[PDB]
C-alpha cells in the first residue's frame, strides 16, 4: 500500500553502525537470510501488517534469530492484538480520569536522550493505589499503558527518528523509587508484572535504557554486587542509582531535555498541569511530524 510505503520512507530506517548486531542496516549475511525466511513464513500464514524490517528484526532479536520461535512469538502477539483490540485502542479508549489520578502514579514522556530515544518517566515511589482505585481500575491503567505504547510506535518513534537522523526503536526509561516502601511495592507488584509481560511479549526489543533512581540501599547494593556477572549488553542498558543520580542521567540526556527536578534544565508550565499532564517532544514539532499526523492527546 502507498500509505504504508509513504510512512516507512518518511523517516530514517537504519540504526547507527555502532548499534547491536542484527539491527536495521547492521545485518550480516545470515541475519538477512533469517529475515527473508521469517517474512515469507508469515506471509504464507496470511499476515499482511507489521511485516517491515524493523518489526521482524525485533522479534528475531528477541528469539536470538531462531526463525521458528520468532514466528511463534509474532503469531502470539497478533492474536493478543486481536483479543485486546490493540489495533483500534487509540480511537476506542479514553483515559478521561487522567487529570484526576496522574499524581497518584506519575507516568509521562518528556523529550529525548542523546541517542534520540523518547524519555519515559515513572515516579513509582509516589504510587498511591488506594487513592487511584477510588477513580479507576488496574484494567484501565493497563489499557492506558498499551494506549501510550501504540502512541510511541505510531507517533513518537517516527518523529524521534527524523529528529535524530537515524532509526530509533527504543525508549529511555527513568523510574524514580523515592518514597517506595515494602508495603507499596507489594501493592504495585501486579501492575508491574502485567506491564513487563506486555512489554516483553508484545513490544519486544523496545527497551533501550532503564535507569532506576533513588533506589533504597539494599536494592542498590545488590545490583552493585552482582553487576560483574551480567551480560555486557545488559550492563550498558540497566542502571540502578541511589540519591546521586543526576550526573549519571546527564551523561545520557542533554541538560536542556532533562526536567529540572531530576537535575536538568527543562521546564514546563506548572500552572497548566505541569509534568504529569505534559507530553512534550519532537512528536509535537511539525518539523518532525510526517504523514501520520500529530499524536492524539490523552
Ligand atoms: O520495554 C519497555 C517498552 C515497552 C513498549 C514500548 Cl512502546 C516501549 N517504548 O519504546 O516506549 C518500551 N519498557 C521497559 C519496561 N517498562 C516498565 C515495565 C514495568 C513497569 C514500569 C515500566 F516503566 C516500560 C518500558
Q: Domain segments of the chain: what residues?
A: 2-89, 91-288
β-bridge pairing 118-122 and 171-176: parallel
What technique determined this structure?
X-ray
CA of 194 to the centre of ligand 1 (A): 11
185 lines ligand 1 (CB under 6 A): no
CA of 204 to the centre of ligand 1 (A): 10
Secondary structure of residue 88 in the 3-state scheme = helix
Which residues lie closer than 8 Å to 139 by C-beta, 6 or more apart? none
For domain 2-89, the CATH class is mainly alpha
Q: Which of 186, 172, 149, 192 is nearest to 238 (CA)?
A: 172
Give the largest CA-CA distance in the chain.
55
The conformation of residue 128, written as its DSSP 8-state character, comes to -
Q: Name the residue of 81, 177, 199 whose CB sits within 8 Å of the most ligand 1 atoms, as the mutation to test its pocket.
A: 199
192 lines ligand 1 (CB under 6 A): yes
Say how far apart CA 90 and CA 296 lie, in whole Å: 8
Superfamily of structural domain 91-288: CRAL-TRIO lipid binding domain (3.40.525.10)
What are 173's strand-pairing partners? 120, 210
Contact between 57 and 24 under an 8 Å Cβ cutoff? The reply is yes
CA of 199 to the centre of ligand 1 (A): 6
SS (H, E, C) 156-176: HHHHHHHHHCCCCCCEEEEEE
Contact between 222 and 77 under an 8 Å Cβ cutoff? The reply is no
Q: And the C-alpha cell for 234?
A: 545488559
Amino acid at each position: 500500500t502507498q500509505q504504508e510505503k509513504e510512512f516507512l520512507e518518511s523517516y530514517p530506517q537504519n540504526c547507527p553502525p555502532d548499534a547491536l548486531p542484527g539491527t536495521p542496516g547492521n545485518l550480516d549475511s545470515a541475519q538477512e537470510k533469517a529475515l527473508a525466511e521469517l517474512r515469507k513464513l508469515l506471509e504464507d500464514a496470511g499476515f499482511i501488517e507489521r511485516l517491515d524490517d524493523s518489526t521482524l528484526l525485533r522479534f528475531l532479536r528477541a528469539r536470538k534469530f531462531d526463525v521458528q520461535l520468532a514466528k511463534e512469538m509474532f503469531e502470539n502477539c497478533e492474536k493478543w492484538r486481536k483479543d485486546y483490540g490493540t489495533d483500534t485502542i487509540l480511537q476506542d479508549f479514553h483515559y478521561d480520569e487522567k487529570p484526576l489520578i496522574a499524581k497518584f502514579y506519575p507516568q509521562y514522556y518528556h523529550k529525548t536522550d542523546k541517542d534520540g530515544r523518547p524519555v519515559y518517566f515513572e515516579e513509582l515511589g509516589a504510587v498511591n493505589l488506594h487513592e487511584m482505585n477510588k477513580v479507576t481500575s488496574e484494567e484501565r491503567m493497563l489499557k492506558n499503558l498499551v494506549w501510550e505504547y501504540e502512541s510511541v510506535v505510531q507517533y513518537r518513534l517516527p518523529a524521534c527518528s527524523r529528529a535524530a537522523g537515524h532509526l530509533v526503536e527504543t525508549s529511555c526509561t527513568i523510574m524514580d523509587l523515592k518514597g517506595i516502601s515494602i508495603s507499596s511495592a507489594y501493592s504495585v507488584m501486579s501492575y508491574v508484572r502485567e506491564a513487563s509481560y506486555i512489554s516483553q511479549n508484545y513490544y519486544p526489543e523496545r527497551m533501550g535504557k532503564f535507569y532506576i533512581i533513588n533506589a533504597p540501599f539494599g536494592f542498590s547494593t545488590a545490583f552493585r554486587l552482582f553487576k560483574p556477572f551480567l551480560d555486557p549488553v545488559t550492563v550498558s542498558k540497566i542502571f540502578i542509582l541511589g540519591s546521586s543520580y543526576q550526573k549519571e542521567l546527564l551523561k545520557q540526556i542533554p541538560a536542556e531535555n532533562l526536567p529540572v527536578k531530576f537535575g536538568g534544565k527543562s521546564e514546563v508550565d506548572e500552572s497548566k498541569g505541569g509534568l504529569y499532564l505534559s507530553d512534550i517532544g519532537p512528536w509535537r514539532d511539525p518539523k518532525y511530524i510526517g504523514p501520520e499526523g500529530e499524536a492524539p492527546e490523552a
